């Protein structure tokens with residue numbers, strides 16, 4: 167039909183050209199239709215409109231997550247019979263801050279030592295390898311696996327990590343699996359945490375699941391601990407693995423920038439911020455439901471309708487960023503949207519910045535690292551909410 171269906175099938179790092187077309191049209195908010203459900207939706211692609219949307223308290227994120235809300239995702243992101251309301255459950259139980267406490271600057275100081283040491287250890291192992299090696303399987307996977315165990319879930323086994331990663335990949339998709347496969351992925355993840363969350367939270371370490379289980383308050387429910395574990399998987403696993411893979415690709419495609427960072431390590435934090443702007447992650451959009459009839463940049467939104475913002479489209483808006491499709495670590499542009507904006511700004515932003523910085527520094531210290539094939543030959547997992555290549559073949 168003549169209404170665009172969403173998402174735009176841009177599973178690689180090449181953003182759908184449709185985002186720039188909509189940005190340049192005469193509509194600040196464009197009506198689209200969810201491919202997976204047929205639900206009507208609104209879509210924002212301009213930075214200035216996105217700021218107005220995401221800072222407006224009359225637009226609710228949680229309302230756009232509830233069962234029956236118009237939605238881009240083909241299946242509800244919750245096991246049948248569960249609330250899928252983890253942040254609110256923690257607030258209700260009195261755990262207003264445990265997320266911020268386990269992911270904020272103090273947590274970063276507790277974890278940044280081993281995170282940087284592991285990034286260096288992993289890269290040093292690759293520096294001893296022959297021929298071609300896979301940065302996805304032999305850098306991103308061990309690093310993100312350590313992150314998830316040590317900061318989020320506890321000492322998982324390899325079978326448990328793979329099960330949870332498979333659940334995330336299967337449920338957090340627009341296509342490439344059946345409806346029942348996706349639902350069962352949320353079911354399997356839920357039943358894993360009903361079975362094992364107490365034990366995982368009891369292992370040594372300072373992981374968030376333990377902090378949540380041991381926090382002050384009645385005591386936290388079994389269902390409640392499962393919701394918390396599910397949240398940490400969906401929010402921290404595919405995001406970290408996808409972003410680190412994508413960031414590595416960006417760096418490999420910009421050897422001049424890497425050479426500069428090798429010569430000027432003090433410039434690495436600015437490079438991290440430019441990676442968060444330039445490197446695309448989600449193939450969908452952040453979204454909010456209007457809690458009352460309202461207007462944004464002249465467009466009337468009725469209560470109950472859901473407005474999406476593509477963070478990728480906003481990060482590539484030439485009204486905000488001069489030469490927005492250039493990777494420019496020295497950029498002094500406005501704040502990027504890689505972590506969102508406003509109330510729901512990524513609570514893990516400090517820890518993510520920590521792991522991205524350790525990755526950038528590991529690459530920058532070792533000149534000669536290159537993609538072993540052309541970027542057009544990288545294979546991408548089709549339909550994931552959070553883009554991720556199947557492998558990153560690399561050489562010295």
Ligand code: HEM
Pocket residue numbers: 227253269318397398401402403405406409410447452453477503504505506507509510511512513514515517518
């Ligand atoms: C490079 C890595 C990451 C990126 C780019 C990223 C990005 C984002 C973005 C854009 C949002 C906003 C969603 C919205 O506005 O609706 C968000 C929310 C969130 N992030 Fe991150 N994230 C990353 C890693 C992590 C990690 C490691 C965790 C650890 C658990 C985490 C936890 C969360 C949570 C719980 C939320 C939901 C907050 C809410 O809805 O109020 N993120 N993230």
Ligand SMILES: O=C1N[C@@H](Cc2c[nH]c3ccccc23)C(=O)N[C@H]1Cc1c[nH]c2ccccc12
Pocket residue numbers: 227231243244245250251252253338393396397400401551
């Ligand atoms: O905390 C949230 N914020 C927003 C945006 C968001 C942040 N990170 C994401 C990763 C994937 C999709 C959306 C988000 C949301 O839409 N949903 C939950 C997470 C969630 C989704 N399905 C669940 C099942 C059980 C427990 C938690 C969740």
Ligand SMILES: O=C1N[C@@H](Cc2c[nH]c3ccccc23)C(=O)N2CCC[C@@H]12
Pocket residue numbers: 238239405447448449450451452453477551552
């Ligand atoms: O692809 C998605 N992204 C998040 C928001 C987001 C955008 N960029 C992000 C980056 C990290 C975490 C979340 C996001 C979201 O709300 N979704 C609902 C169904 C599709 C799914």
